[PDB]
């Protein structure tokens, strides 16, 4: 259950806000990098109109979710001008 969303990344900052992974967890029951907020006027808000909770499965080709949140935030910015977001449904509140 993974949705494929290509989004145009902003220059030095994107426009999303991630909750935590294995290092820093919102939940010790599923270490999966979540978006808890959309940054207003950024990449997420301009290019589409998703939900935050879209749980970053693969970004580009890097295997995130069960990572440090620092490896997924870095792989989100390391996408360049174009974030290729692939997002799995595990725990939707």
């Amino acid at each position: 259950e993974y949705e494929e969303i290509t989004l145009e990344r902003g220059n030095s900052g994107l426009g999303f806000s991630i909750a935590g992974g294995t290092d820093n967890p919102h939940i010790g029951d599923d270490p999966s990098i979540f978006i808890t907020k959309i940054i207003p006027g950024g990449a997420a808000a301009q290019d589409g109109r998703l939900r935050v909770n879209d749980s970053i499965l693969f970004v580009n080709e890097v295997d995130v979710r069960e990572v440090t949140h620092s490896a997924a935030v870095e792989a989100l910015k390391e996408a360049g001008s174009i974030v290729r977001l692939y997002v799995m449904r595990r725990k939707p509140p």
């Binding site: 900052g13 994107l14 999303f16 806000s17 991630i18 909750a19 935590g20 820093n24 967890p25 919102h26 808890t36 907020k37 940054i39 949140h69 620092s70 935030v73 989100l76 910015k77």
Partner: peptide, 6 residues
């Protein structure tokens, strides 16, 4: 936890 802005 801490939410990192991206």
């Amino acid at each position: 936890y801490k939410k990192t802005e991206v």
